[PDB]
Every structure is written in structure tokens, then in C-alpha cells.
Design a protein around this ligand. Structure first.
Ligand SMILES: OC[C@H]1O[C@@H]2O[C@H]3[C@H](O)[C@@H](O)[C@@H](O[C@H]4[C@H](O)[C@@H](O)[C@@H](O[C@H]5[C@H](O)[C@@H](O)[C@@H](O[C@H]6[C@H](O)[C@@H](O)[C@@H](O[C@H]7[C@H](O)[C@@H](O)[C@@H](O[C@H]8[C@H](O)[C@@H](O)[C@@H](O[C@H]9[C@H](O)[C@@H](O)[C@@H](O[C@H]1[C@H](O)[C@H]2O)O[C@@H]9CO)O[C@@H]8CO)O[C@@H]7CO)O[C@@H]6CO)O[C@@H]5CO)O[C@@H]4CO)O[C@@H]3CO
Ligand SMILES: OC[C@H]1O[C@@H]2O[C@H]3[C@H](O)[C@@H](O)[C@@H](O[C@H]4[C@H](O)[C@@H](O)[C@@H](O[C@H]5[C@H](O)[C@@H](O)[C@@H](O[C@H]6[C@H](O)[C@@H](O)[C@@H](O[C@H]7[C@H](O)[C@@H](O)[C@@H](O[C@H]8[C@H](O)[C@@H](O)[C@@H](O[C@H]9[C@H](O)[C@@H](O)[C@@H](O[C@H]1[C@H](O)[C@H]2O)O[C@@H]9CO)O[C@@H]8CO)O[C@@H]7CO)O[C@@H]6CO)O[C@@H]5CO)O[C@@H]4CO)O[C@@H]3CO
Ligand SMILES: [Ca+2]
Ligand SMILES: [Ca+2]
Ligand SMILES: [Ca+2]
Ligand SMILES: [Ca+2]
Lengths: 597, 597
């Protein structure tokens, strides 16, 4: 091997919250060397060696007096000497104070390979392990950053204010590289998507259109083709000494009074799959590496926040420190952890401010609301149940378990589950109820690309490829183009219109962002709730039955306070409320009313 | 009425914790009288007069200097004078400190009408509204206290240490009087069961056999034929002015940050059914009445605790005071609330010691563990699921939500749900798993009469009559008789023998009463857990599959610590533990090992 092959992070910033910076330097016999530097405000701590002669960790303390600039780090040993020009950048104005995504936002989720192919020429890149195959469900289809940039106006036009793409970091695998969840280089965009600079441009172009950029970060694991695997930095870098030992996924084991250490360790150290080596985050070098890398992306790419994969599969103590570090840099940031459980207590455990039985503490601002999504999908699909919506109501009543339920991400769907329209049984009227719910709950809504034109999938079991079909219009030659509206059916277009109507309306509804919620127990699969404050009331009523239903309004008087009627935002019709609310079969109304004193 | 028709409570005790005693006096124009008395230590408080001429509430303060004895309360008015000789009983030594049922106990549950007809002559009682009909599923079959007493040896012989009969208080209804849940006289045993004195004798006879007696109390409602209903003590004694307004059962509404007052009021004030007038517990006279009545039963009948029906259907503030009052009198008592929800947070809300988001405080020691019973019934029934036992494991992991999870009552079944054997799909092997689970969990186990001989029922929905078939041997002429063994199949006898073996064994296993629990995440519907302390380990392993399973024992070494083998208590077979645990199809083993160092 040659010179310095990797320097990570490759540059940094003056004026960060945490003064320490740990450089991970890789190259043949770099560990046999001694580093030296001279720059006011930067102090070189002095080596703690690792047995591997091919890695050197350099500990810097960057004082508040250190100014933007650059300086040489010089490595000397065995009659030779190596050099790296290290840059400390100036931070953009307002960087530390950046506002993360919140209740007023709506997030549009894409898989960058499956959204838009702006440049067919990067579909394959010389030297990489996988060839593109649009006809393979698990293959690379060729979506890229150029295609995403091309369609930012579309996403903004739909009413979305944040973009969350699944990971774009290099995944140089021989197969299943497209999904991004097995990083082979945490400091590089996969060249098939574009360059590091292209990703920065994506952020800047999104910001021009009023949209934030949320990065999808994996912390627990990497891909087996990561360059580390060819020469392990330390013998304990990867859990189980770099050998495949599978997790059995006992997620409660990390938060269970009756847990076996075997099960907790298996959850946090066990390999997700054979092709995903598990990072030993109990090694402080690994912890520092991940914390610094994610900060580096936030700072470099001007992100509004993060979505954190496989949340509890990382070491718990590491997550405590990681969340503390990120949030100390960016106190107004949001980060949404993916803790995939339908049990509210299991999700709620991880949110900042939670008083946990075991004293577990976290600075994680948000989690994905799998419990509530599961409840609504059940309600809308099990149409033979007398009162399926009761599950939604009862799940929501558990919100007190969360320190900040209003900061949780509620979603129509995502790349891991059945398509929203399919989960609703291809029932457009019931799908409308799901959409209304998503846009009116005291949550941060997230929507999955393609759902706005009722893309379908298999509903039973798990079928990842079926959830990730190419967006129509993302590829040259497509017969239908959802970006332009060309070739959409009337129902598809009606869906897209409704999404655009509701999401744009929602942006302008402070009562949804921070108003109160009062809901009523569902009765025979009818459900009424209100968002309210002194300025506005929004009354949602849904009739989840294939028959008309009539609801006496006396029941709702603490919210209605004698309102004789209101205008339904959906239909534009005036709806009577004096003595009863008459719902047509499978209907939902969104009645807008004056404030509640 | 004839002078004083009802005096309630009819007598009291010297030396109670709460000095106050409120007498509810009933009779024609008694409300027009004025009470007077002269007895050392007893003070008459100045009157508070309700507009109903047929009732008088008399407030006494019984100071600690009041001795046991009697004194006349004289009621003077309109030139007439009525007397009542009031008695203060001496309390039994150790009364206040009585030990309530706890984790070392096992509760046997009966319905008195359905267990044993010791006296056919009381099946009908002249004057009563219902005639017995043994062939009618919802009729009175004639079981009584004499029959229960006749068979205490049998219950004690099975290994049970507490008897819980469903209510024996008067239910003088035209139809469905048998079940006891619609009281028509809170101070009287239904004469078809026997007298008040017979109930005291049931308690004393049970005690002679090492068994406590747990009374089933209804607080929220009475029956429509209660004598109150003919002449309402106050206009607000019954919720909704004594007229039927149904509850819609929105149980979470009393513990939901988004609750409507309409829903929460409807839950606690709404009538359970038309035949069950709802008590207005916000009226302090109603509150005092119930508190005193239940204390009266505890003191009079020498009870070891209570089972409290329809728990959250009572007023929340009333419940705080009721539980406070009862626990003040009897600090070591146990009372188990029936809060029928399969959601851990909903049940846990009510247990003494819980820190609730809304500051709600309760003194209730115990609740019925519907969530865990539901989880195990799901695991045993969902035979098409690869790992249904995962529900049990995850539910258990939520025990940190309860202040005192070991004090919760775990049950094989009860009078409101499908028969335990039917719940296991009539699979003897799965039934054994449920039984072992019940007898080894950190819980107070409760068992439903008839389950020890594998009685069956319908499985779906609610079918009360199906769960409540006459105990075989309870009636003269029965051709299957569980008391003698006559007519039982080999399998039914084996069930009975196993109940006896495990219950009696449990009695002598402190490690089950107060030991730790460590469980392991179930894998492919195999599950291993341990009860352990310095003295003993008890390993439970179950294979919920119709194929053999081989579990490497490395996994369990934090509990096994190299144990080469053990003896299965159940089969009495030796079980290898050195390298692998071989489980036969549908097996459960229970292995005793010495305590860990
Ligand atoms: O970065 C890795 C991935 O992380 C992220 O998502 C993961 C979550 O963090 C993690 O918790 C977990 O979620 C599970 C959740 O916790 C569970 O409660 C449960 O929820 C329900 C589930 O959704 C239902 O489908 C069902 O589960 C059963 C299912 O019906 C049944 O078919 C079977 O599933 C087995 C598959 O059939 C089998 O093929 C294989 O799965 C493969 C998969 O086919 C393959 O494509 C590959 O997956 C890739 C994936 O495409 C990538 O995107 C990347 O995934 C990341 C996610 O995108 C993140 O968001 O990497 C993956 C790994 O390479 O590999 C899979 C693994 O072999 O095995 C399956 C079983 O082992 O059985 C299941 C039950 O076991 O019912 C559940 C109701 O309780 O399941 C959640 C997952 O669906 O997993 C997330 C990754 O999916
Ligand atoms: O003291 C009263 C009883 O209290 C104790 O148990 C009750 C629990 O505290 C309470 O939480 C709830 O528990 C669960 C319930 O058992 C489950 O069924 C289920 O309930 C939901 C159900 O799944 C839904 O379908 C719906 O139920 C409605 C139902 O669909 C609808 O038809 C109607 O119900 C009527 C019946 O269908 C009809 O037959 C008749 O009922 C008769 C009954 O057949 C007869 O035996 C007699 O019932 C007695 C009972 O036998 C007594 O033992 C006593 O019950 C107490 C329990 O034993 C306690 O342990 O009193 C009963 C009389 O009230 O008389 C009945 C009335 O004539 O009429 C029914 C009523 O119209 O309406 C229901 C309700 O809307 O919603 C259910 C709630 O969401 O899950 C519940 C908890 O989640 O009820 C327990 C009693 O079953
Ligand atoms: Ca491309
Ligand atoms: Ca891990
Ligand atoms: Ca009888
Ligand atoms: Ca009530």
C-alpha cells in the first residue's frame, strides 16, 4: 500500500462545541510513524498506539482560539516522512443554531436509486462490483442525485418541506448495493449517485426551494466489502472479532428488568445479516469515528437532521454519548431513530427526557411512530371489525409515555413495509382517511415517494423489492410520468391532487403544528377528533364503514360549543353540526371552525 | 316500612382506624326524626338532612376510648319515638394486621351457584323473583355455601390457599340472578346461598384448612331490583337521575391526555347495562356507604382480601379514597382490581405506587394481569406463528411499568373467558405449558374451578354460560364427579393430579414467591426462563412445536453456570444440560438446581 490512503475526517471546522478531534489515518506502516504539527490553538495530544502498523490515531484538541486555516500534519519514522494538509474550515453563519425538522414540516422520503435517473452515464462506474439492472427487483436501477435535484420543484410543489433519502454513502457490494444500508465508505457518496459535492448541491438546491435535507445514517453496521474488512483497524473493531455471528433480534433485551446479558449483547453486537459486519461501539475509537463522521456530514452538507437506522442495534452507552454529542453541536436539530416496535413503551424508552426504570438516558429527539401506523393500517384493512378504529384511539391515548409525542414522526409508509394504498386494501376512500390522519395528527408527518399516485405492493409477509418500484417519470422513456401528470389514471391523479392539497394546507396550519388534540372514543368505526387553540378548531370525522352513519353532536359539545355548522376543507361543502353529523359511507371530513375560547 | 326498615352498617367495632361512622337509616318518615344517644366515647354529630323523609344519615365519632358494648340510638319526631340498640363489637386479636393474600398463595375461584349444591332446599326461597332451572345456561342451578363448605378439603388438597367466590350478596332479579354482579342488598347473603352467618362459617372453615377467603365486590353498580330503586335515597344517588344512560366503555378516557370529559364521565357514570343502575360515587353518602360496607364484610367475615369488579367504572377520586380507607384499616391486605385491558400501561395506571402523568394516586395493591394471560393464550393458540411465545416474553419485559408486578394476579382463566383447556386448543401438552407458566411466574396465581379437570367451552367472543358449567360432582346424581374421581377420563384425572402436584409444590418454593426472574428471548417457539435466588434455581423450558428442538446450552450459561444435567420435576426424567438441551415435541420441563454462588 501507498502513502496515506485514508484520512478521516478529511478536514474539520474551527469553533465546534467539542474541542477534541481524533484523526484516523490509514496507510502502509503509518502506525510506525510519529505525527507533528504547528498551528495556533491546535494541540497534538500524543500517541496511544494500536498493534496494527497500518493505522494511526491522532488526537487533537482544537481550542476556541484556533482560527480557520490549514496546516501540515507531518508523520516521521524509519527514515521516511509523510505529510497531510489539514484544513479547519470556517462555519457558516448560524450553523450551530440550525433549526431541525419539526411539527410544521412534512417529510418526503425517497430511495435515491429508485426515484429519478438524471444521468444514465453514472448507472455503472468503472471498478465497482455491481452492474446496473433495471429489470432486477434487487438490482441498481440508476437513480441519482442529478435526478433528485431535477425534481425538487415537484417535491416542494407537493407541500413537502424536508427530503429524506435512504443512504447515499458508497455501497460497493456485488449484489443488493442499491439500498444503501451496507456502507463501504462512510466518507464518500456512492459514485453511482454522484460526488460529495453533488450531495452538498442537493442540500443547497433543496434549501432554495424551502426544503431541508435529512440524512439516513447507519451506526450499528457496515457492508462486508468495506475496506476495513481487508485489514481490521483493531482486532475488536468489528464485534465477534470480525466473524459472522447473527443477531436473533431480541430488541426488548436492552430495556427489560428480566434480561439476560446474552440477549442484550446479542442484540447490540450480533450481526444484522452475514453481509453486514457489526461495529464494536464499545471501542472508543469506533464511537469517536461514528460521532465525528455524522457531525462531518451535518456540517459539510448543511443537513436539517438525521434518520437513524436500526436504532437499538447500537450499543446503548454509545447511543447515549452519540446523541449527547450531536445535540450538543446542534441543539435545535432533530434526529429520528428507527426503533421498529409496535409497543409504545419500547419506542418511548429512547426519547430525550424519558425517566427510564434503569436510568437509561438519551438525547434522541424523535422516533418513528410504528405503533400508531400499525394501529391505523389495522383499522383501515380489517373492515369486518365493528370498531377497528378503537386501536388507533387507544394507541394515541398512550402518548403520555413519550416526553415529546408531538416530535415523533408519523408516516404513511416507507421502503420496508407494504405500500400505503395496498395496506388500505386498494380502497381509495379508506386511503383518504389514512392521509387525513397523517396530515392532522400531533406529529411530524412523513410520506413515502410513490404513495401520492397509489403505487401498490404485495401485502403479506415481507417483499422489499415490491415496496421500491421506480417512480414513474424518473427514467427516460417512461410511458407515465407522475412529475408531469402524463399517463396517470384518474384515481392516481386524484390521489396526487389530494396529497398536494393537504400537504400545502398543512404548512399553513399552526393549530396542527402545535395546537391541542382532543379525540373521542370511536364508536362503530366512526371517529371524531379536534385540533384546537384559541384561533382555530379543526374537526376531523371519519366513517370507516360501508354504510351511512349519524353522530349526535351533543357528544362533542366541549369542542363544538354550539357551532351550528362548518365548511369541510375537502369538499368545500358546509356541514351541519347543530344536532347531528351525517356521514356518508366511507367518508372523511375536515371541518374548519373558529377558535375555541 | 315498619319503624326502622334498614340500619346500615347494622353494627360496628370499637377500635377502628377511622373514628367516623355514618349510619344510613331507612324507614317511613325516619328522616323526620332526630337521633340521640349517650355512650362513653361516642359522639353524635349535628344533623345533615336530605329531602327524602324515608332516610336519615346519622354521623357518629367513635373515639378510641369507646369500649365494646351497646347503646340505644333514639329517633324522636312528630310525637313518636323509635329505638335501635347499636352494638360495638370487640375486634379479634390481630384484626387490623391481617395478612392479605400474596405471592406465596394460590387462589381457587368459584361461582357459588355453579360449584356445589349442598342443600337443594334453598334452590328456591319463598318470596324471591327467580325460580331455579338447572338446564338453563343463564339460570340458577342451586350451588350454595353448604356445598362450598362440603368441599373445602378438596380445594385445600389441590394446593390452593385462598378461595375467591364470585359475589354471594343478594341478587333478587327476575332473570340472571345467579351471577351475583347486580346486588339488591349489600348487607345480605342471597338466601339461596345461605345466611350471613353461613358466610362467616365459610371463612372460619376455610381458615381451619389453611385458606383465606377473598370477597368479590362491586362498587360501580347495583341491580335494578335493589330496594333503593323504589325510593331513591337522594335524587343523585344513582347517576343520570336514576334513569338508564349507557356507558360506551371508553376505558382509556379516564387516563388519556387527549380525553374528552364526555368520554371520561361516560365511563364512570354510564350504566354498564340497563339492569345495572350506576352508583354516583361523587355523592359522599354513596362513597361512605360502599367504603363502610366493604370494611364491614372484611371485619365481620374475616376476609383475607377483595377482588374488585369493573374497576375503572368507579369514580377515580372515589377510588383513591376507597383504597386509602381500606388500606388504612388493613395495611397488609391485598385487593385485586379487575381492569380488563390487554394493554400493560392501562392496567399499571391503577397499582399503588405508580407515578402517573396526571398525578393520579391509588392505594390498590393488585390488578388482574389480562395482558400476560392474553399473551400466553395468543402463544398457545397461534399455532401457525413461528414464535408466538415472543408475545409472552415481550409483555413480561414491560413489568417495570408496575410498581409491584409480583403482586399482580396471573390466572389460568375465569368466569368471563374461554375455558383454559379450550384456550389451549384442547392440547394437553400446551395446557401443561400454561399451567407451569401460571405456577412459576413472579405473580400471584389464580385458577378457575373446573380447569383442573379440563372442562371445555366455546372459544370465540363472549359466551358467559359456556364458561360456567356445573362442577362435576357438585350435584347429587352426577355421573362424572371430580371430588371422588368417578367418571373422569385418564386425561382429566392426569390434569387434576398435575394441578395438585404443582400447586402443592409451589407452596414450598420461596424462590417462586420472591425470587428473581431471568428469561431468554424465545426462538422458534422455544422458551427458557429461570426463577433464582441464593438458595435455588428453577429452570423452565418449553418447546411449543410439534417437532423436537435442540437448544445449545451456551446461550443460558449466565443461569446454568456449567450444570451438567437436572431432573425434570414433572416427568421425573433426567434432562441433559451440558452442551445441548433436547426438548421433545410440545414439552415443558421444570428443573430444580442449587442456588448460584
Ligand atoms: O440496515 C438494515 C435494515 O434496517 C432497517 O430496517 C430493519 C429494522 O431496523 C429492524 O428492526 C427489523 O424490523 C423488523 C421489526 O423490528 C419487526 O418487529 C418485524 O415487523 C413486521 C414485519 O415488517 C413483517 O414483514 C413481518 O415479518 C416477518 C415476514 O412477514 C416474513 O416474510 C419473514 O421475513 C423474512 C424474509 O422473508 C426473509 O427474506 C429475510 O429478510 C431479508 C430480506 O428479504 C432481504 O431483502 C434483506 O433485507 C435488506 C433490505 O432490503 C435493506 O433495505 C436493508 O434493510 C434495512 C432497512 O431498510 C432499514 O430501514 O438491509 C436488509 C438486510 O440485508 O435481508 C433480510 C434479512 O435476511 O428474513 C426475514 C426474517 O429473518 O419473517 C418476518 C419475521 O422474522 O411481521 C412483523 C410483525 O411483527 O419485522 C421488521 C422487518 O420487516 O428489520 C428491518 C429490515 O427489514
Ligand atoms: O359486573 C358486570 C361484569 O363486570 C366484570 O366483567 C366485565 C369487565 O369489567 C368489562 O371491562 C368488560 O370486559 C370485557 C368483555 O367481557 C369482553 O366481551 C370484551 O367486551 C367488548 C366486546 O368484545 C365487544 O363486542 C363489545 O361488547 C358489546 C357486544 O358486542 C354487544 O352485543 C352488547 O353485549 C350484550 C351481549 O351480547 C348480550 O348477550 C347481553 O349480555 C348478557 C349476558 O349474555 C349475560 O350472561 C349477562 O351478563 C352478565 C354476566 O354474566 C355477569 O357475570 C356480569 O358480568 C360481570 C363480569 O362477570 C365481571 O367479571 O354481569 C353481566 C351483565 O352486565 O347479562 C348480559 C346483559 O343482559 O347484553 C350485552 C350488553 O348489551 O354490548 C357489549 C358492550 O358494548 O364491547 C365490549 C367492551 O369494549 O372486552 C371487555 C374488556 O375489554 O365486560 C365484562 C363483562 O363481560
Ligand atoms: Ca444514473
Ligand atoms: Ca450492533
Ligand atoms: Ca342449594
Ligand atoms: Ca360507574
Amino acid at each position: 500500500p501507498t502513502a496515506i490512503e485514508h484520512m478521516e475526517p478529511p478536514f474539520w471546522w474551527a469553533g465546534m462545541q467539542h474541542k477534541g478531534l481524533q484523526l484516523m489515518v490509514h496507510g502502509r506502516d503509518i502506525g510506525r510513524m510519529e505525527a507533528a504539527l504547528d498551528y495556533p490553538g491546535v494541540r497534538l495530544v500524543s500517541p496511544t498506539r494500536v498493534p496494527n502498523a497500518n493505522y494511526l490515531f491522532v488526537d487533537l484538541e482544537i481550542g476556541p482560539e484556533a482560527q480557520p486555516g490549514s496546516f501540515d500534519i507531518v508523520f516521521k519514522g524509519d527514515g521516511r516522512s509523510e505529510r497531510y494538509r489539514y484544513r479547519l474550515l470556517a462555519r457558516e453563519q448560524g450553523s450551530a443554531q440550525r433549526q431541525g425538522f419539526g411539527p410544521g414540516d412534512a417529510i418526503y422520503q425517497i430511495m435515491p436509486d429508485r426515484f429519478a435517473n438524471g444521468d444514465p452515464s453514472n448507472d455503472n462506474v468503472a471498478g465497482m462490483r455491481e452492474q446496473a439492472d433495471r429489470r432486477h427487483g434487487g438490482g441498481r436501477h440508476g437513480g441519482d442525485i442529478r435526478g433528485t435535484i431535477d425534481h425538487l420543484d415537484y417535491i416542494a410543489g407537493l407541500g413537502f418541506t424536508q427530503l429524506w433519502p435512504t443512504p447515499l454513502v458508497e455501497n460497493d457490494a456485488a449484489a443488493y448495493s442499491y439500498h444503501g444500508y451496507a456502507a463501504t465508505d462512510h466518507y464518500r457518496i456512492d459514485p453511482r449517485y454522484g460526488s460529495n459535492e453533488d450531495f452538498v448541491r442537493l442540500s443547497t438546491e433543496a434549501r432554495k426551494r424551502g426544503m431541508g435535507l435529512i440524512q439516513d445514517v447507519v451506526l450499528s453496521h457496515i457492508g462486508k466489502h468495506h475496506w476495513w474488512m481487508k485489514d481490521l483497524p483493531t482486532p475488536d473493531w468489528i464485534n465477534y472479532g470480525g466473524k459472522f455471528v447473527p443477531t436473533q433480534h431480541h430488541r426488548v433485551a436492552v430495556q427489560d428488568p428480566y434480561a439476560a446479558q446474552a440477549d442484550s449483547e446479542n442484540f447490540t453486537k450480533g450481526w444484522f445479516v452475514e453481509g453486514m459486519p457489526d461495529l464494536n461501539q464499545t471501542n472508543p475509537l469506533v464511537a469517536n469515528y461514528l460521532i465525528q463522521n455524522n457531525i462531518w456530514w451535518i456540517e459539510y452538507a448543511g443537513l436539517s437532521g438525521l434518520r437513524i437506522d436500526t436504532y437499538g442495534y447500537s450499543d446503548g452507552a454509545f447511543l447515549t454519548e452519540y446523541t449527547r454529542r450531536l445535540m450538543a453541536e446542534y441543539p435545535r436539530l432533530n434526529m429520528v431513530g428507527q426503533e421498529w416496535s409496535t409497543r409504545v413503551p419500547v419506542v418511548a424508552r429512547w426519547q430525550r427526557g424519558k425517566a427510564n426504570f434503569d436510568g437509561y438516558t438519551s438525547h434522541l429527539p424523535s422516533l418513528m411512530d410504528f405503533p400508531l401506523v400499525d394501529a391505523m393500517r389495522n383499522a383501515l384493512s380489517k373492515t369486518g371489525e365493528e370498531n377497528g378504529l378503537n386501536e388507533v384511539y387507544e394507541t394515541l391515548s398512550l402518548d403520555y409515555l413519550y416526553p415529546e409525542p408531538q416530535n415523533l414522526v408519523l408516516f404513511g409508509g416507507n421502503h420496508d413495509m407494504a405500500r400505503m394504498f395496498s395496506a388500505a386494501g386498494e380502497d381509495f376512500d379508506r386511503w383518504r382517511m389514512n392521509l387525513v390522519f397523517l396530515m392532522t395528527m400531533p406529529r411530524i408527518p412523513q410520506f413515502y415517494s410513490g404513495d401520492e399516485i397509489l403505487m401498490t405492493s404485495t401485502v403479506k409477509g415481507r417483499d422489499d423489492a415490491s415496496y421500491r418500484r421506480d417512480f414513474p417519470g424518473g427514467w427516460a422513456g417512461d410511458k407515465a410520468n407522475a412529475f408531469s401528470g402524463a399517463g396517470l389514471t384518474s384515481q392516481q391523479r386524484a390521489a396526487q391532487d389530494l396529497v398536494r392539497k393537504l400537504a400545502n394546507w398543512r404548512k399553513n396550519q399552526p393549530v396542527i403544528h402545535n395546537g391541542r388534540l382532543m379525540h373521542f372514543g370511536p364508536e362503530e368505526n366512526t371517529w371524531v377528533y379536534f385540533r384546537y387553540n384559541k384561533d382555530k378548531r379543526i374537526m376531523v370525522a371519519m366513517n370507516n364503514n360501508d354504510k351511512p352513519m349519524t353522530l349526535p353532536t351533543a357528544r362533542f359539545q366541549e369542542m363544538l360549543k354550539g357551532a351550528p355548522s362548518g365548511v369541510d376543507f375537502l369538499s368545500g361543502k358546509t356541514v351541519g353540526l347543530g344536532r347531528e353529523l351525517r356521514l356518508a359511507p366511507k367518508s372523511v371530513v375536515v371541518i374548519e371552525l373558529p377558535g375555541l375560547p
